[PDB]
């Protein structure tokens, strides 16, 4: 019960092939969620190179709605994985607590779940055992997918375990006897999650288990009048028992109900002495390789937008002056152009001291404020 600098505590929940416990940092008190995978229960090959492949693969799936994995600690008896902790509990417990949800919150959870499944599909991994007991809520009422590929060990060995272990959440293809369960199981599970977020109950529920398999194989489900008919077309296009007509991520992204309230960050791509001191190379002014009659016009166009008051003495000597908004006094400086060579010209700044007035604020910091607004507009 001690990994890294984390002690363990009680048991958060149970999984299909994983025991989820709560870990606590002994100094900071931050809550982590460890996931135990017994090697005695399921282990294809016990070679340490596969553990190296886990360390290389599983950590790099960083997404703001996927639970990030921190490290995979090896053990002769088990495998520990330190996922992050969320204090809002499972989605199924939230549905059993609050019943039917509002449509504007169900779409907000559904977009985040679909953007967590689409990130996994872009990174070539599926979550075949997806259910409202495997998606969590945080404190900020978001949606978090618990295990992206950890369910795959259940699927890899035998499909019969997937049907027997999870009779409710199982695709018609899988119970019909298809070998490999692809992303159509992800779309079907996200449709069951959407029906749970819109109606509260489960669409395929029976007491007798072969009748439950027959109900999953049948493409009919209950529909109340509490939900609008604009989303029941999406549910019928998403919960097809035949995968040729089942919806894709693009077929949800072109639907009308999905595009109503959509945040832009869901989809990454729019198309489908003791201390060390490092020396710094400072410059003098602004090095512009243009014509000298145009640089003064560029400076004038820059300082005209900032509402300054300036006069000239030479054609390249400009004594500018601005009045501060909150501070009653005014600040003055002087720009001058220099010819270091025939190609480039340097714009050099010079300050002048206030002679008689005890001005408040600061002199040189307002001098740098007369320049930090000019460098940005000139951008040279």
């Amino acid at each position: 019960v001690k990994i890294g600098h984390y002690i363990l505590g009680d048991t958060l929940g149970v999984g299909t092939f994983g025991k989820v416990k709560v870990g606590k940092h002994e100094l900071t008190g931050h809550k982590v969620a460890v996931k135990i995978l017994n090697r005695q229960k399921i282990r294809s090959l016990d070679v340490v190179g596969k553990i190296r492949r886990e360390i290389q693969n599983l950590k790099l799936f960083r997404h703001p709605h996927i639970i990030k994995l921190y490290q995979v600690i090896s053990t002769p008896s088990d495998i520990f994985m330190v996922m992050e902790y969320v204090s809002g509990g499972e989605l199924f417990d939230y549905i059993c607590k609050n019943g039917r949800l509002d449509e504007k919150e169900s779409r907000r959870l559904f977009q985040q779940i679909l953007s967590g499944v689409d990130y996994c599909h872009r990174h070539m991994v599926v979550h075949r055992d997806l259910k409202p007991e495997n998606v969590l809520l945080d404190a900020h009422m978001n949606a978090k997918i618990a295990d992206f590929g950890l369910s795959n060990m259940m699927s890899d060995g035998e499909f019969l375990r997937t049907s027997c272990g999870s009779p409710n959440y199982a695709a018609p293809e899988v119970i019909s006897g298809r070998l490999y369960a692809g992303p159509e199981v992800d779309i079907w599970s996200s449709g069951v999650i959407l029906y749970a977020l819109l109606c509260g109950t489960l669409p395929f529920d029976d007491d007798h288990v072969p009748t439950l398999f027959k109900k999953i194989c049948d493409g009919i489900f209950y529909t109340p009048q509490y939900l609008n008919p604009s989303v029941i077309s999406l549910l019928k296009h998403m919960l097809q028992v035949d995968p040729m007509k089942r919806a894709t991520i693009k077929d949800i992204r072109e639907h009308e109900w999905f595009k109503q309230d959509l945040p832009k960050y869901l989809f990454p791509e729019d198309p489908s002495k003791h201390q060390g001191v490092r020396k710094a190379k400072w410059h003098l002014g602004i090095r512009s390789q243009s014509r000298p009659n145009d640089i003064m016009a560029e400076v004038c166009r820059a300082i005209k937008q900032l509402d300054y008051e300036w006069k000239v003495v030479n054609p390249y000597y400009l004594r500018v002056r601005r009045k501060n908004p909150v501070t009653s006094t005014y600040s003055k400086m002087s720009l001058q152009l220099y010819q270091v060579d025939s190609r480039t010209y340097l714009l050099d700044f010079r300050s002048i001291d206030d002679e008689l007035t005890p001005r408040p604020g600061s002199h040189t910091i307002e001098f740098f404020e007369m320049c930090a607004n000019l460098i940005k507009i000139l951008a040279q």
């Epitope: 294809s44 886990e54 693969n57 590929g149 991520i249 489908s272």
Partner: antibody, heavy 126, light 106 residues
């Protein structure tokens, strides 16, 4: 229940454009990349074309680069290999096959071709 | 962009054969093996050169040694007499092997 029925094959004149399809029945074409292969009589397999509809990225062999425009229609679950400017050497039986790019296991990025069609025989002769 | 080169052999029923596949460039563990009966469709045997595809039983086995992918057929049944194909898939273009045929000893 996956069957990949090819169509549009037969016999063509050299210098004529052909478009053979692959009716993907039993799965969805938008996720999996339909790959075409070439099986010359007596020789081995040879990969020719690829289209991946999920990211919208295609692939091509070096010998058929820029001459065989592959297309995929997600509404009818077909894959259109529109061949153009074919040579006399391109005379083979063309199998259709789906391609599984996903992690079936934690350690193995599966990258093989699971389900294969019967393949139609195109014959090019003057 | 690369090429493949298997061997060619022939053995008896129940013999343990092996087929190498020397990859040209440096590839990952993304090499498959396709059994094609004459006048049939190429059946998949082992997808990542080390783990068995579901379906066909455990007689077919594969090992990986750098860039020399192997296909070993222990206890050769009288139904497994067909042409076997190496297949590189890690890079952009896909290049098949030359294809080894397995003939019965006579």
């Amino acid at each position: 229940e996956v069957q990949l029925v090819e169509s549009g094959g037969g016999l063509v004149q050299p210098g004529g454009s052909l478009r053979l399809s692959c009716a993907a029945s039993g799965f969805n074409i938008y996720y999996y990349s339909i790959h075409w292969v070439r099986q010359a009589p007596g020789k081995g397999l040879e990969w020719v074309a690829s289209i991946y509809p999920y990211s919208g990225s295609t692939s091509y062999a070096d010998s058929v680069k820029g001459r065989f425009t592959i297309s995929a229609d997600t509404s009818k679950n077909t894959a259109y290999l529109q061949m153009n400017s074919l040579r006399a050497e391109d005379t083979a039986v063309y199998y259709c096959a789906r391609y599984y790019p996903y992690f079936i296991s934690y350690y193995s990025k599966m990258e093989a071709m699971d389900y294969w069609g019967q393949g139609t025989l195109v014959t090019v002769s003057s | 962009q690369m090429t493949q080169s298997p061997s060619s052999l022939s053995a008896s029923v129940g013999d343990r054969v092996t087929i190498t596949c020397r990859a040209s460039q440096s590839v990952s563990s993304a090499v498959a093996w396709y059994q094609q009966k004459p006048g049939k469709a190429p059946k998949l045997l082992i997808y990542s050169a080390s783990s068995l595809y579901s379906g066909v039983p455990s007689r077919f086995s594969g090992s990986r040694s750098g860039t020399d992918f192997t296909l070993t057929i222990s206890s050769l049944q009288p139904e497994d007499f067909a042409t076997y194909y190496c297949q590189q898939s890690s890079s952009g273009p896909i290049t098949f092997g030359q294809g080894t045929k397995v003939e019965i000893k006579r």
